[PDB]
Amino acid sequence: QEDVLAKELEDVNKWGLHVFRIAELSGNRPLTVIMHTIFQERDLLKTFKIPVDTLITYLMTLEDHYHADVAYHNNIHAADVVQSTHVLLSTPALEAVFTDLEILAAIFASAIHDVDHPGVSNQFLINTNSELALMYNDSSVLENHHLAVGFKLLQEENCDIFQNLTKKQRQSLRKMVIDIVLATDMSKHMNLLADLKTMVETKKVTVLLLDNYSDRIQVLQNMVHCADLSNPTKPLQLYRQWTDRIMEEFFRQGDRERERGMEISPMCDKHNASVEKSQVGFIDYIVHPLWETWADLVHPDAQDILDTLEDNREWYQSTIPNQVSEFISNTFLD
Numbered sequence: 001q002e003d004v005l006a007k008e009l010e011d012v013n014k015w016g017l018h019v020f021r022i023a024e025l026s027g028n029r030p031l032t033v034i035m036h037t038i039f040q041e042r043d044l045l046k047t048f049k050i051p052v053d054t055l056i057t058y059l060m061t062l063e064d065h066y067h068a069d070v071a072y073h074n075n076i077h078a079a080d081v082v083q084s085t086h087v088l089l090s091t092p093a094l095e096a097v098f099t100d101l102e103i104l105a106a107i108f109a110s111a112i113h114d115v116d117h118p119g120v121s122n123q124f125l126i127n128t129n130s131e132l133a134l135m136y137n138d139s140s141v142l143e144n145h146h147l148a149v150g151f152k153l154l155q156e157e158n159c160d161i162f163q164n165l166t167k168k169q170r171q172s173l174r175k176m177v178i179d180i181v182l183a184t185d186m187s188k189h190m191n192l193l194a195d196l197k198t199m200v201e202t203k204k205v206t207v208l209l210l211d212n213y214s215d216r217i218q219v220l221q222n223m224v225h226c227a228d229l230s231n232p233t234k235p236l237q238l239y240r241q242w243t244d245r246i247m248e249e250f251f252r253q254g255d256r257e258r259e260r261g262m263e264i265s266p267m268c269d270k271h272n273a274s275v276e277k278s279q280v281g282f283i284d285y286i287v288h289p290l291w292e293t294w295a296d297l298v299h300p301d302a303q304d305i306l307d308t309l310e311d312n313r314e315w316y317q318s319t320i321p322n323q324v325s326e327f328i329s330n331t332f333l334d
């Protein structure tokens with residue numbers, strides 16, 4: 001089994017890693033083994049003097065605080081966004097652009113970005129007056145929680161993977177990670193995309209040239225957001241599993257809504273679902289516009305990702321036997 005797991009991990013730098021197989025082979029530890037592999041490959045243990053046992057202990061605890069019973073927002077998703085961010089960081093157009101600390105920030109933000117997700121949306125938590133929505137005053141409720149948990153876990157026994165960073169490095173990493181994870185709040189999508197467009201319009205090359213924090217952090221925010229919305233750009237066997245998982249999670253939120261006598265949210269009604277038309281809409285109004293802009297920023301590095309996305313759209317279009325539009329307006333606008 002150890003030999004087979006290592007053969008799968010050989011694809012860690014490739015778009016389309018068999019992350020589900022890795023989850024099976026690791027005894028459901030895809031986040032831990034993927035993060036460890038990535039930390040080794042990028043020499044981040046040596047650079048930031050992170051003891052290996054400390055890394056593993058944090059990683060295992062982080063992974064335990066992802067909910068295994070939640071169908072999509074679980075440790076397998078987290079592992080995937082980590083690995084996708086890892087690949088995007090190595091695109092040719094960004095060679096030598098980011099420091100090691102910025103790289104660590106992006107990867108760490110990706111690892112914690114959904115930790116302790118309950119499998120229901122921000123709008124559900126707000127509308128049911130949940131404890132979390134009360135704690136966070138209705139704004140980026142989940143994302144503020146993921147951050148709080150991700151950092152609090154560093155305080156458990158032998159979990160402080162940032163113990164040998166300088167005070168300035170810790171502060172700077174924490175500021176970046178907060179900015180990145182808050183930008184994963186889906187309601188920020190349109191503003192993020194607008195800002196990414198504007199940056200592409202004024203971009204300078206030599207490989208991209210990024211002069212200031214503001215431009216660098218924008219690119220990292222968008223990167224991780226692209227990684228979070230990367231499933232439809234993956235090989236179709238992977239995409240299809242991610243779609244089945246997200247619909248299961250949504251339909252479960254619908255069932256909770258139904259039991260409380262609430263109006264069933266768009267995309268959450270298992271009795272009135274249009275899975276394939278809804279993916280086509282998601283790709284057309286959200287994922288293709290974002291990834292086309294990312295592809296411009298890194299031109300021509302992301303051409304194959306775009307082509308896969310377009311092929312994957314045709315497949316869902318071809319398997320069709322209020323809701324999309326209401327879901328989009330409520331989810332991706334401020």
Ligand SMILES: CCc1nc(Nc2ccc(CC(N)=O)cc2)nc(-c2cccc(Cl)c2)n1
Pocket residue numbers: 120121122186229231232239242243244246267278279281282324327328331
């Ligand atoms: C198969 C990949 C996938 N991922 C995401 N990601 C996503 C969208 C919204 C949220 C917020 C939430 N409701 O939890 C979270 C993730 N959304 C979808 C989706 C599904 C149906 C319809 C739409 Cl517009 C989007 N599909």
Ligand SMILES: [Mg+2]
Pocket residue numbers: 113114142184185
């Ligand atoms: Mg999230």
Ligand SMILES: [Mg+2]
Pocket residue numbers: 131
């Ligand atoms: Mg409580």
Ligand SMILES: [Zn+2]
Pocket residue numbers: 077081113114228
């Ligand atoms: Zn996510």
